[PDB]
Each structure stands twice: as C-alpha cells, then as structure tokens.
Design a protein around this ligand. Structure first.
Ligand code: ICS
Ligand code: ICS
Ligand SMILES: [Fe+3]
Ligand SMILES: [Fe+3]
Ligand SMILES: [Mg+2]
Lengths: 522, 477, 522, 477
C-alpha cells in the first residue's frame, strides 16, 4: 500500500507489516534457509583470528578485489588527448563495463568504442573488425585520433595490433596520416594502472620514436608532467595551477579534466580540451619529464629515459607536506623559476591547519587501500599528521613498492604498528579490521560493506568509512576534489578531522548518557 | 511525427556512415505500421554489432552472471577469468534480496579466480579446483557454486565441466559450470539462453521424483523478475493477496531451493519473456507446466494481468482477484489524479534491453504520456512482434541503436523525457532533456505493481517538471 | 582507573562502572532529582503542539538566540582594513568575548583592544580612558589606524566618541593626522550585523565626507564592493576571483581575508593585507558601489548614495544560480567587461551538478537560520534545487525582509509549505522541528543541541544538522569554505546531497533488516 | 635565564610604553626570589587594567555567571541585559554535568532578556517579572532561578532584588539576584565575590532549621571545582574510595540541593581558593565548618592532599588513604615511566586565571618539566604568596600581562611549551611553540586526580613532541 502524499520507496516500503509477513513466508516456505542461530554462529566465526588465518592462506580464490583490469586505464589515458576516441580492440562487453564504471564515478558521459569481435574471430583473427571499426569510428564520431587498446579475447588469440592497423591504412580504410597509437593491454597482467602505462607509452612512441633526429633536450624550455591513472579532477587542476603560479612552462601529457567536466548548457560535447598531438610530438624537446605516479609509470619511464634521454627525477607522488615540498623544489631546480611567495604562503597555511587540528588526529588508527602511489602518499601524510596507518592494503602492489613503504613507516614512530599488504583483497581487509580494530577506514565505496559487517558485530566494533579513492559511487561530486599538493593535503586533513568529530558527536549524542561530552566547541 | 518525416530522418542520419555500415543499420531502423504486424517484414534484430559505432550492448557474461545466476542469493557465483568483469559488475545491478551478506547470502560480493598470465599459459582448471576448496572453507553456508566463464576460459581450452563434476562429487555439492564467455553470441541475450540451459542441466531436475513438498492447486512461480529495487516483492504481494502461493522467484531474491521446487508448480508466470522463455518452454515440455506472459507495469496492465492469471484457476481466485483490484483502486486513482495532469501529453523515447522498451508503455499511458520511439539492445523478432502492437502508428523503432543515431533521433524528435541507461543519462541531461534510468530506476523503485506505480509516477514527475531544466541557457546568451 | 597504553578521556572514561556507580550515588544521595518518569513526561510535553503554542506566546524571555551584539560586527569590519586595530570604547569583558568568539570560528588570532572603562567612569565618563587608550594602543601595537566602536556601558552613560577623540588629538595623545574613525554600536539595538554597517559607514565618512569637492563618479573606472559581515574566507576570495576573471577593476572595502588566514611559518603577524586608506579615500571616484549583503548595509547605502552619488544597484546577495547570474550581468553592465567563457562554463558546471543530483534533492524539507541575506540566499538556492525550506528563522530579521522572502517563496511551488519567522530563537525552532518535522536543519553549531533533543524522542524523529553559517565551533576549517557564487552553490549542493546520502546509508546499514537498500551506487 | 637577564628583559620590553603605562606595568612584573616570601614586597595585583594594552581579562559577569552560578545544573540562569554576553559565553566553558538538558538541567542553554532600547529607557524590571513567569511555564522542573546582571542593569537603576523577592514569594521559588555587572571590579574576580555573597544571602541558609539530614563523620564538600572535562568527578571518586562522603560539589555538576546541604558537612575541601574562599570563610564563621586548600594536579600533589585530608578524620580513613595510594601507584608510575622521558627538561610558560598558574606546577614537575614563567589574569596578593613558594628561584612572574608583553617574553625565553587561553593559542602556534589550552584543556581532560594525570601527560607529550613543529620553515628558506 501507498499513501499518495507520502509515497514510500523500497526503503521504508518493505518494512510495512504486510511486506514483512510476506517475506517471512517466502523464507520459511521455500528458501530452506539456515537457522538464524547458525547464521549468527558463522558470522561470529568470520570475525575471529582463527578465520583470519584461514582467510590469509588463500592461494586461488579472490574475494572483493581492490583493482580493475588494464584496458580501463588505457581508456582513461586516451580520454586525456584532444578529440581522441578510446578504442578497445576485442569484445564489446568490456567497453560497456568500462564506460559505465567511469559514468558512475564522474557522473559524466564516457565515450569509448569497441570493434565487436565475436566467436568466429578465434578462427581467423580480428583484422576485418579493425579495418571496418577504424573507418566506422572515424566517419561517425569524427575523432582526430583513435587510441587502440585490447581486451583479453584479442590478447589470447594473439592479434597483431600493429600489423592490423598498418593494413587498415594500406587498404584505404583510414588515411595513412590519421593517428592510431596502440598498446597491448592484457587484463591478466597487472591491473588498470598498468593499462594506463602501456597506453601512454604507446602514444608517446607513436609520435616520437621515428622523429628523434631533430630533437634537442631542453630546447622548448618546458617540463613534461605525466599524471598517470587519476580520477580526481582537482588533481589535474592543482598541478596546472601550481606550475602556472611559478611561471613554469609545462606540458601535461594526458589531461582529461575538460572532457570529464563539460557544462550542461544544451549541447553534448563528445570531446573537450585534452593534450594536443603537437604536445606529444614536441615532448622530447622538454628539459625533463616528471612522473606524478611513478610506481605505475615504469614502462613510460624506460621510454622517456631510453629514447627521449630525459633524466627523470626521483620524485614521490606530490602528496602531503614533504613530498609537495620536494616536487616544487625539483621543478624550481629544473626550470630555474623560484618558488613564489603565493605557494610559500599556501604551504604555511597547510602547516597552520596541521597545528590547529593535531590534537584530534594524534594517534588515530586507520585501515586504507588504493593504488600504489595514492596509498604511499596517504601513508606519508598520515605520518606527518601524527596518525597511525595500521592496515595498508594495495591489491595491485609489488614487492619493491612494499619495501619502500615499509622504509617510510620504519622512519617514523607513527609507523610502528603498521603492516603493508600486497596481493590481498578487501575480504582480507575485513578480517584485519575485526581482529585489530582501527578507528576508521580510508577507501573507496566497496568499503561500505566492511563498515556494514563491523556494525553487525556491534556499535562498539563499527569502523566508519572515509571515502577517498576510486571508485566513489554512493556520494555525489567527490570526483571534483583534490588529493595532491598543499590544496589536496588541506582537503584530506579537513575530511579526516571532521570525520573524527562527526563520529565523536554521534557517540556523545545520547541524552543523559553520553552527552556530557557533547561539546559545542572542539 | 508523420511516417514520411520519420523515414526521411532515418535516411538523413544514415548518410554519415560508410557504405557497409549504412546498409546494415538501415535494416535495424523502422517505422511502426499497423498493416505490418510480422516484425520480420520491417526490422532485423539479434545480429552482430557493426564495429566502431558505439553500441550500448554488453556480452553473454552480463546476461548469465548479471541476471540469471548472480541474483540467486544463497549460491556463490565465481567470475572465472581475469579481474575486470567481476569488478565492473559488482553490485551494479539492484537485484534486491534478504540475507546476511558474506554468511548465508552473497549477491553483492565479487568472487573471482583473478587470472594472471601464468593461468593463461598453464590453464586455470587446477586453480578453479583449489578455489572451490577455499570457498567451502571460508563460506560454509553457501548452498551451491556457479562458475561464470569470462572470455579466456574457452579460448585456452579449459574444461570447467570436468572440474565441476569432479569437485561436485568430492564435496557432494551442486557446482554449475556456465560457458557464458563474452565472445559468444552478440549481446547479453545468448548469455540468458546459455544460463537457462545450465539451470536445466545442473539444477532444475534435482527433485524430479521427490514428492516431499506439499503442493497446492494455487502454486505458481515468478519467472523472469530480477527484483530491481524490490520489483518482484511488489508483484508477489499481489499474487498472494489474490490467493496464490509463489513457490519460487527467478531470480531476484531467489534461492537454489526455490529453483529446485519450481517443477512442482501449476503455472509459470513469465515477466521477462526474453531472458527466461527458454526454461519456461522446457518446463512445459518436460513437466507439463503451462506458462503465460504478464505485465505488472502500471494499473491498466497490472489489472489485466491479475484477471488473466486468475482466469487460469477457479472462481475462488477470481473472487480474490476482484477484491485485490478493489482494494488498490483508490490508491492508483489518487496517483493518477495527482500526477497525470502534470505529465499529460508529454512524449517519451525509450531505449533499454530486452523487455522494458515495450513493457512500460502502458504505465506511461496511464499518466497520459506517449512513447514516440523505443528500441532494444538485444531483443529478437518475437520481442519486436509484441512491440509493434504496444507502440503507436508511425512511431520510431530502433534495434541495437548507435550512440550517434540515438543522439540524432533525439535532436529531431525532441522528446520531453528519455528513459534509458547509465551510458546515455549524462549525454541527454547536458542537452537539457529530462532523463530517467530505466534499468536501475535511478536508485528508486520498485516500479512493478500498484505500490510501484506510485513511485514511478512520482519519479517521472520529479524529473520531467524539475526546475533545473529551465536553467541551461545563461541569461546573457 | 587508566590503562597506560589506552588512556581514556572523559568519554569514555566516565562510562566505567565505578564512575557510573559513583554518579548514581551522588544523584540519589544529594541532588533531590525529579524522578525519571517525570523527566520523561515533561520532555515529551516539550515536543507537542500544546507546548509550541505556549512557546510562541513568549514576550519577555529569549532562549538560545541566533544573533549577537553590534560591536562584534564592528570588530570584524575594522579587521578588514590595512594595519588597523579594532578598538572598543567601554568595558573590557566584551572584548575578551569578541576575540574568543572569532578565535573559535576562525582558529586564528583576533586582535582587538579595550580602553577598560570601570565603575568610576559611570560618574564622570570615559574621556580619560580614550586619551590614554589611544596613546597606549598606538605606541604598543603600532597600527596605522584605530577603528573605534562602543560597548553598552559607554552607550548608556552617553560618551560622545567624536568629542573624546577630538580632545585626544587636541591634547597630544595621538597625532592630529592619525586616522581614528568611529561608530556608536549599542548592543541593545539591532544585532552584530548592524554594528558592521555602523562601523563601515563611520570609516567611509572619515575618509570622504570632507573631501568630496574633487571627486568625479566613474573617474577611477573601478567598482566598489562592500561585503558586509562575512565569516567564510572563500566568500571574499570567490568575489575577488570572479571580478579578476572578468577583468573588472574593483576595490573590496573591508577585506580581512589575509589577516584571518596567516601562515604558520615561525612569525606571528598581528596585521596582514586589508583595504588601504588610499582605497577608501579614492572610493567616491568609482563607477558605482555594489553591496553584497544589502539587508544589513542600509546605513552604508544611504551614505554611498547621498554623499558619493553612486546609484547602488538593486542586487540580492550573489547566492545560488539566478542571483549569481544577476550579479555578473550587472557588473558587466557597469564595467563594460563581458562575462568571460570561464565563468559561463563554471555556471554550466553548476547546472550540470544540479541535473546530476536533483533526484535525491527533490522535495527534501529543511529548517534553517542565520543572518538575513545569508538566509534568503539559502532559501532561493533551495528552491532552485527543488527543495522545500519549510521553517525559515531569522532572529535579527525585520518585517520588510520577511515580506521579501515571502514573495520569493510565493513565486515557487517549492515554497508552499514554508513559513518565515522573525524575532524568534532556536528554542522556537526546536518546537517546529518536533511538530512539523523536516529532513534536515541547515544552521550553525548551536543546532547540535536541537539534533540531540530530536534523537532523544527517537531515531525516527532525529533531524540531522548540516553546518552552514556562523559560528561553527565543533568542526575544523569550515570557515575556509564558500557560499557565494557558482563555487559556493556547488559546495552547498555537494554538502546537501551527500548529507542526504550519508543519512540514507545510516538508515540502511542494518544487516538483513534494512541493508536491502544499502546500494553501492547512488 | 639568570635573574639579571630577566630584569633586563623586563626593562627592554617596557621601553615601548608611554610613561604612565610604563610605570604601572613595571609594578606587575617580578622575578621570583627565595629571600622574599611576601608578594606585597615584590608584585602588585588586582588593580585596574591599563587602557588600550590588550589585557586578556574578562569581567565580573564572566566570574559570576561563568563559574559560580552557570554550572549549577538544575537552576535556570538569566543573562539579564542585551544579547551579547550570554551568547558569547554559551557553552564555552566545559562545566560537565549529568542531566536532561532543557527538561531538568540547563547549563548549556542561553536564557536572556535580550534588552532593546525600550528596556534601557523604561527599565527592565517589568520585563524580568514577565520573563520569570515564562520560565516557570516553559521549564517547570527548574529548581530555582538566578539573574546574572550585565552592564546596563545597574547603570539604568533597575531593582532586580525587589523583583526577586516579590516573584520568589509569589511563586514559592528561590530567585537569586546577582549584581555582577561587568563594569564592577577590574576582572572576573569581583564577580566571584559578588556571586559568593549571593549564594550566602539567598540560598545557603534555607535548611538552617532542618534536622532531617542523616550526617556522617566523613561528610565533605568539594568547594571550587567547576568540573572542566569531568575534573570534579575524577577527584570525587578518590575522596569516596578513601571512605569520605561528598555531600556537595561547588559548582561543576552541582545542584541547588547540594548547595543547601553543604552547611551540614564536617569539612569544606577548597580547590579553587580564589573563587570560593569567600563562602568558605562564611561557613566557618557561621556554622563552625573548617576548610582546607588541596591540590589534585599530578601524583605528588594528589598524594599529599589525600594524606592531609585523611589526617583530619580518624585512623580508619588514614588506612583507606594509604590503600587508595597503593591502588593507583602502579598506574601513575606507568604514566611517568612512559611520558617523563619524553618531556624531561622541557620548559613551560603559563598564563591563566586565578588558580591553575601555580596549581598545575607540581604535575609538570612530575613529568620532569620546569615552569620558567607563570602569571594570572586576576589573582590577588594571597595567590602570589602561594605562587612564589611553588615557582623556582629566578623565574618570571607576570600579573595581568599584556599581549605585547607575553609575546616579547616568549620570544626571549623561548619556552618549549606554553599553557594559556584561547586568545593566546593561535599566536604561539604560528611562532612554532607547542601550545596547550589550560582553561578548556583543549577539549580533553579530566586533568585532576590520578585518572586525570594520565590524560594530562598524554596531552603534553602529544603536543610538545608532535611532528608538525618541525615543519614551519619551508626547506627553500
Ligand atoms: S532481464 Fe534483461 S537490460 Fe529481462 S538483460 Fe537487462 S533486469 Fe534490462 S530491459 Mo538492464 S531483458 Fe531484465 C533486463 Fe530486461 S539488466 Fe535488466 S534492465 S528485464
Ligand atoms: S574558577 Fe577561575 S580563568 Fe578558579 S574564573 Fe577561570 S574553572 Fe581559570 S585558572 Mo578559565 S580561578 Fe576556574 C578558572 Fe581558575 S574559567 Fe576556569 S580556567 S580554577
Ligand atoms: Fe555530470
Ligand atoms: Fe589557524
Ligand atoms: Mg532519502
């Protein structure tokens, strides 16, 4: 039933007694459900150290991963180039999923095509799909560049992308000068960040490998900036803002911030902004190339050093105070531009906020996950704030990365209770937040199910989620935020301290029970 | 728009294509005509997509894992292959269920074999066997396992049916191998069929000679309702108020025991024909169980369905049917009185998957609205047959529409509202056209039944009449 | 007791059994407390319509006001001028409170002096305090200007500020050329916003009243901006940013953005930034003057129109979409500068967010309070979002203002269930959120006690507080936020939709009870 | 710093002042000397503040409403006058209490008469009488009312004492008129005294002829603990573990009945001497109740206090005293072992109100720290007498310090930690000097007792050793 002036959606409609009675009858009549006492027993068991040890003995089963597959990252990379259509050679189901995954995080259109290979291609390969696909795409969507990656079906059958694209041009399906950079992006290797690296290196190769003879390092007086897999609009924007503040000439290579934030003005804009083809062609002439997320830009690094002959600086992601400092100092060294007063003041405003909020942050314990560079930057900043990052999970991390984070932790008294996990998933993390309970989780929207699980054990066991990372699907417009630079550090600090104070207010809101500590001033 | 205008629009839009794609896409675009009731005389469907044109379709894995198997709440479904497929589809579909997630129910979790290159080189059957043992240790209350194959499985020659047989025997466990690799078929549709056949071959006959279930003359099953936002619950309540006993729901909020009890029912009630007509025909052939199509979108269709269903039983059910209709009459009449004046005359274009592009037309018309164009990602010609009857004369019909086509049709027809998916939503909002998601219900619903009609009406009104749509043009431009 | 490795502060220390038993014994032994059943009965009564009617019959008692007194606003105004010391003639206890109030909101030093009038001054007045006070202040803190307001003791006894300052100069306590603008700011008239107006008009008079002969309207080609009482740093910054984006020459008159946000770099800076004396002297030469908060700048308007001869445009506070549009169009008209592509795109990005979030915002019901201009701008934007602002409270509002807001409400279908209250307090508002429950409150930190009260009635009756306004004392760094312009509208929208989604997640977090609607994607 | 350096620092700082202020401030600054024990031979205090110099002091209303009356939880306290005073002071002080706020307790609320100009012209006595009626209607469980006068009340000649007598008799209600107008006195201090006399004159004698109270030999009152963050509770628990019965707490978590029962106790235990010595002397004069000063900051002082208090009773209490000391010994020893190594040798400067500037010194020394400067906003010479004994030889002492003075002293002395108020906090953080709020405890505490020492130690360590203090200088400067 409904009352027309107060219509109920699923919540709370299905809490009405008739719906409750119906659901009880469905269960008892036909579901052959385990008894509630047994469900409770197994639930309790899943919160124990005994269960944790079995859970961490897994070798074959993955549960609730914290990574995605390569072509997702190739698509995001390709989107950062002017009038460029991401194009994934292989099965079309993948492309529906890539688009919808990004649709939900950015709340924006996400343009990407497939060439719709089907079962028959296992006999004869996907060459004809590539020929017709490139021609159809260029004619229909009028890109100026098509950036080609692969799905796993095309990788298993072994399609030679290079030959297929060359043959598409030779046979007249597209003009030979039309740019079609490509990268093999097998989903069974690495993760979505590897696909970004592979795609970027392929685009870099396409525009520079065969034209190096006339290049001179430093002749265009600019610094190249490679952002890597990046899903906060504020991070592209803050890097450009800081470099412009310093008067530093730069080229941001892969810049989707315009096409992921077009206005709603009556027109749909399939393309907007982006790195130009000329910026990629001219990039070897930069003074140097800075990699903002070096732990997933290894192939790009080898090409930029081996072919462009740039001496890529040893910089961490510019997150937190020390590593934003180091980024600005290195950019100043390379460019010859001084750090301007405006950025020095911004730094001291971040330090001011740290002194103002340090008493609520001190000793707070966190579980956190994400991609390697993001996680290590968050760990570093938490240590700078006097916080304890006790459970650090990077499903797509590697042993060298783990060693580097362990060294960062060992250098700080705030790292003494911290453990770094690689190759583990959010079902592993669920155990850890039961057996060694932290104050908060910092992670993406998949963390909400862990918070739900912990509350079921009891209010005193609940671990609230703080949403920082990718994907964030159950809040709106957090993709506009910043995590890099002083600005991003200010945003993270503010989110952390106010999450602490929100939770404290909740715990002290009880009239005549806990509200003795429900202070107006904090 | 007149037939002549629509035909001219179709040809104008097709001018952009290369010849081969132009000739193909012309076969998938049509203008409804009452003199042509056989869809195979006017539109082609269930064919390959043309490369590079930005189809909105998914794959067979989405059809099998997404709708048929994944919602079954007390089984664990393995996304078998690399990490992508299971992650992009994790909890994206709102197949509502009652359970204790991670303990006795598992729908919103993502179980996967996370194939690495070593698994491509050596095969994944050993990994799959080890994975099953780990599932049994860590999730002891699971009541069965399914293996949802992703693209690499069949391409590298793995034998998941052998693993499923051997491990199922070892553990006395129902383990269902599903060969729903995305390279199979042309869309989600073949995934439905493959998944139906897997139900048939591995689960449905389990209780064929078991007589311990006490049946009644009023036992039915809900076939093809994936309980989006509780849609199946808002249908079940009506069927049981009418005196029927819903023994099973396939697959929203479903359970493996419900599936196994379904051959005991007296009538299969099919909502989504596209995805479960296969198993419904099988159950009629094998068990003699009749099936019928019904429609619980809007009061007109819901009333028609209840009456048609009740007519299959006896006077006692028909009496309760009219009592249900009388109970809810004031409720939907009040929804109409509030919202139809606010929506009358407004024109809708739809594009969805395999059922809803025709099934929701009556609900729009119950609010005085008109569906002036519709189409499907992956319907077959028997779907288009049913569609031509529901849609008006001279309306536009599109099969496997391209992004370019959909945008250009919308620019010309200028609908007041568009109902489609997440990949379409933000395009049309930027054009200033109110948009409602008609897969996820835009995180609202249920839309089925009388209780769902109220939510549907509130939702079309909140979006179509929203103040934001008057604000897209800057006052200085 | 304490365990050294997990020390407990008051919460949860006093929940230990021995403290609980001790507090029970204190109550039963010596507090002669009303029985709990009687406490419950009276509490329930305070939630009823019967109580509400008695509550709204109050004529003499005020409970939990939503305003402060004039001199608080005079101090904030004075802080916006270069090297200026706010100086309050009268009692020193006032200045301790003004400074602590702003300290807690901005988490910054707040410099202000008193001349420490005491009981003896009630016989003979405060002239000598002014003489020594001005000399002591100039010598010790070396301001370039001292801006004088008053406490209520000095108003009641009738000290003539003008004569006292003139006599201080005549007798040599401060140089005759040293600027000492002043304003009478009686706390028993109006509120803190009136004090801002009074102070500003006094400073404007000081620098221009006697030098009008040589002024020519429009000759400096700039627009003056008067911000009024403003406690978000982002609001000063967004106005300056948008005008610079347009290439519009401007003078912001009272600009405390710098002195309320100095860096922590090892130096305390008593003064920073601010409007210069030359800017005030030259302001009559502007094209016009724009008042950002006209409902508390009425005295300033009369002086700018009557003496400077500017034709002050009839503009609402630039909050929300329509009124930001109108502000930019009027500035464009006055200045001759077109609205640039950057701001047109920013507008359309706000519209995009509205389209993205409209389904969760539609029909949501709000109680809200604050100062008159802030409240009416919040109301307007809520209507633009399809929200219902049902209880609108402005303690320091007036009849003409209420008429204007009622007209705004009548023009929108979303205003049909709204009532505007003036002269009422937060104990009045408490009744309204019990008897006609909204979904949320939008207000300052004093609203937390209302949320506490509503939760005590039951979880289903709880009205969560969304903190927007002044003062905000129980969260950190929200004073850095923005509420004006498209940027401020984006921030408000994001906060509102995500407050809705946080609350829905809370209500659907119950395992096997409500988590059927605990969706990953919203 | 040597005595000679400190004396030179004082003279250098005062060179900025005009002659009159220079001569005055010189009298309020001194260097501690063991050979001079009489504060009246070395420092002046409790005098008017010099105009324009940015004193940190408040007013008599803050002393009366803020500490003496406002914390009494089951009375309603009216801030009588214009809207400012009550609003700036609403819930700024953390006087913790147990109750149902708005129903039977009212501490964090702001009741005011919100004077307008009409009330200045005609007087507010008629408004006050009507206000009292409205309070009684809307807050029927209040157990008494106080009227906290703001500046205008006395200046316009209102007679709040008459209103209180008449309305109190009419309503059979305790209504307490307090003439704590901010123009009276020179600081918060006179507000204490006025407020103490109001307790005496209007509340304390109510039960003078009541013999129904069941007294014991171990009955005490805690006098002058305003329960900041629970300070009084963490003191009370120890006194009652020692076998004593705390009949009353003035005024944190206090109640009007506790006040009225206090003349029945055997001993008044005075923590804040400054604010409550007045009523303690009255109670000894009138009721014969002895009083004693004690100190519950840090283990050394807490142990000394417990022993001194126990020595006033009998052997059974003295035995329990040593049992309490033995119980908490391992707890505070573990705090010292953890935190004293992390703080030893560090130098602290304090500036607070009327008690804590000397009262917390022992707790700092229990962590190996040294208080190198201290001072008070509003202490009297008897406070400074007690301070010279607690402070070290040659340390700096400042009365009613100006903002300029405090800043310049800190620049020279370069303390490792400063403990002062909210108006000082953010100045010194910007200078890179760790700061702890020693009124509000920086939203932490309790700091009293053994349980409070653990929190105090944790807090000094978290701030003094925080990583943020190493980062104030940009590496490129
Ligand atoms: S199953 Fe089909 S696409 Fe019949 S794959 Fe798809 S939950 Fe659609 S039009 Mo998403 S044939 Fe169901 C469908 Fe319809 S996922 Fe849902 S909405 S009624
Ligand atoms: S009462 Fe006094 S100023 Fe003794 S007015 Fe002040 S809660 Fe201070 S040094 Mo704020 S004489 Fe209490 C005091 Fe001390 S408010 Fe608190 S901390 S022990
Ligand atoms: Fe968007
Ligand atoms: Fe600060
Ligand atoms: Mg909601």
């Amino acid at each position: 039933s409904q009352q027309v002036d107060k219509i109920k959606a699923s919540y709370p409609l299905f809490l009405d007694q008739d719906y409750k009675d119906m659901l009880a009858k469905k269960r008892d009549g036909f579901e052959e459900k385990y008894p509630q006492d047994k469900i409770d027993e197994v639930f309790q068991w899943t919160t124990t150290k005994e269960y944790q040890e079995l859970n961490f003995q897994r070798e074959a089963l993955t549960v609730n991963p914290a990574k995605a597959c390569q072509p997702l990252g190739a698509v995001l990379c390709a989107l950062g180039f002017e009038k460029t259509m991401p194009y994934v050679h292989g099965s079309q189901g993948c492309v529906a999923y890539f688009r919808s995954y990004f649709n939900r995080h950015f709340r924006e259109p996400v343009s990407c095509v497939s060439d719709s290979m089907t079962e028959d291609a296992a006999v004869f390969g996907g060459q004809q799909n590539m020929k017709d696909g490139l021609q159809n795409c260029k004619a229909t969507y009028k890109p100026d560049m098509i950036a080609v990656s692969t799905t796993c079906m095309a990788e298993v059958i072994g399609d030679d992308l290079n030959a297929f694209i060359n043959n598409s041009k030779k046979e007249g399906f597209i003009p030979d000068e039309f740019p079609v950079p490509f990268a093999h992006t097998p989903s069974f290797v690495g993760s979505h960040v590897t696909g970004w690296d592979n795609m970027f290196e392929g685009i870099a190769r396409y525009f520079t490998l065969k034209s190096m003879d006339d290049k001179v390092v430093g002749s265009n007086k600019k610094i190249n900036i490679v952002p890597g897999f990046e899903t906060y609009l504020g991070n592209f924007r803050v890097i450009k803002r800081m470099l412009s503040e310093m008067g530093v000439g730069y080229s941001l290579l892969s810049d989707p911030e315009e096409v992921l934030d077009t206005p709603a003005d009556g027109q749909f804009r399939m393309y907007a902004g982006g790195t130009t083809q000329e910026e990629m062609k001219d990039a070897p002439n930069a003074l140097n190339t800075v990699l903002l997320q070096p732990w997933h830009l290894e192939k790009t690094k080898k090409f930029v050093e081996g072919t462009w002959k740039h001496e890529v600086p040893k910089l961490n992601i510019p997150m937190g105070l020390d590593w934003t400092d180091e980024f600005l100092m290195k950019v100043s060294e390379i460019s010859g531009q001084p750090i301007p007063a405006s950025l020095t003041k911004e730094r001291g405003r971040l330090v001011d906020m740290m002194t103002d909020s340090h008493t609520w942050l001190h000793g707070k314990r966190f579980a956190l996950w994400g991609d390697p560079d993001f996680v290590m930057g968050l760990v570093k900043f938490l240590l700078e704030l006097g916080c304890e990052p006790v459970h650090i999970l990077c499903h797509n991390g590697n042993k060298r990365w783990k060693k580097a984070v362990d060294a960062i932790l060992a250098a700080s008294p705030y790292g003494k209770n911290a453990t770094v996990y690689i190759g583990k998933d959010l079902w592993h993390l669920r155990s850890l937040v039961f057996t060694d309970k932290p104050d908060f989780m910092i992670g993406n929207s998949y963390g909400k199910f862990i918070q739900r699980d912990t509350l079921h054990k009891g209010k005193e066991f609940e671990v609230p989620l703080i949403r920082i990372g990718f994907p964030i699907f159950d809040r709106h417009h957090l993709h506009r935020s910043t995590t890099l630079g002083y600005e991003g550090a200010m945003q993270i600090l503010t989110t952390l301290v106010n999450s602490i104070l929100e939770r404290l207010d909740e715990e002290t809101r009880g009239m005549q029970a806990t509200d003795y500590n429900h202070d107006l001033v904090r | 728009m007149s037939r002549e205008e629509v035909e001219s629009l179709i040809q104008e839009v097709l001018e952009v294509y290369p010849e081969k794609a132009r000739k193909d896409r012309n076969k998938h675009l049509a203008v409804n005509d009452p003199a042509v009731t056989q869809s195979k005389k006017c539109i082609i469907s269930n064919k390959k997509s043309q490369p590079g044109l930005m189809t909105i379709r998914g794959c067979a894995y989405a059809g099998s894992k997404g709708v048929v198997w994944g919602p079954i709440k007390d089984m664990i479904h393995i996304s078998h292959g690399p990490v992508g497929c299971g992650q992009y589809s994790r909890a994206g579909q709102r197949n509502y269920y009652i359970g204790t997630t991670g303990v006795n129910a598992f729908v919103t979790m993502n179980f996967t074999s996370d194939f690495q290159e070593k698994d491509i080189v050596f095969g994944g059957d050993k990994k799959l066997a080890k994975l099953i043992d780990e599932v049994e240790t860590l999730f002891p209350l699971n009541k069965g396992i399914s293996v949802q194959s992703e693209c690499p499985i069949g391409l590298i020659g793995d034998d998941i049916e052998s693993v499923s047989k051997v491990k199922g025997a070892e553990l006395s466990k129902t383990i269902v191998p599903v060969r729903c690799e995305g390279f199979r078929g042309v869309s989600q549709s073949l995934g439905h069929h493959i998944a139906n056949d897997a139900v048939r071959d591995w689960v449905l006959g389990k209780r064929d000679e078991d007589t311990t279930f006490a049946s009644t003359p009023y036992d039915v099953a809900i076939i093809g309702d994936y309980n989006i936002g509780g849609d199946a619950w808002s249908s079940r309540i009506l069927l049981e108020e009418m005196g029927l006993r819903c023994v099973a729901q396939w697959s929203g909020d479903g359970s493996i025991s419900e599936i196994e009890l379904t051959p005991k029912v007296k009538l299969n009630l099919v909502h989504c024909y596209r995805s479960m007509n296969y198993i419904s025909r099988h159950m009629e052939e094998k068990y003699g169980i009749p099936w019928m199509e019904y429609n619980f979108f809007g009061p007109t269709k819901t009333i028609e369905s209840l009456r048609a269903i009740a007519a299959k039983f006896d006077e006692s059910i028909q009496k309760k049917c009219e009592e249900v209709i009388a109970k809810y009459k004031p409720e939907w009449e009040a929804v109409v009185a509030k919202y139809r004046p606010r929506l009358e005359g407004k024109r809708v274009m739809l594009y969805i998957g395999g059922l809803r592009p025709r099934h929701v037309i009556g609900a729009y018309e119950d609010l005085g609205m008109e569906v002036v164009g519709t189409g499907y990602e992956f319907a077959h010609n028997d779907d288009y047959d049913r569609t031509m009857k529901e849609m008006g004369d001279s309306t536009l019909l599109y099969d496997d529409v391209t992004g370019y086509e959909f945008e250009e049709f919308v620019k010309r027809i200028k609908p007041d509202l568009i109902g489609s998916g997440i990949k379409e939503k933000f395009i049309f909002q930027k054009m200033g056209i109110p948009f409602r998601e008609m897969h996820s219900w835009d995180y609202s619903g249920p839309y089925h039944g009388f209780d769902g009609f109220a939510i549907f009406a509130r939702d079309m009104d909140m979006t179509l009449n929203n103040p934001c749509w008057k604000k897209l043009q800057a006052p200085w431009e």
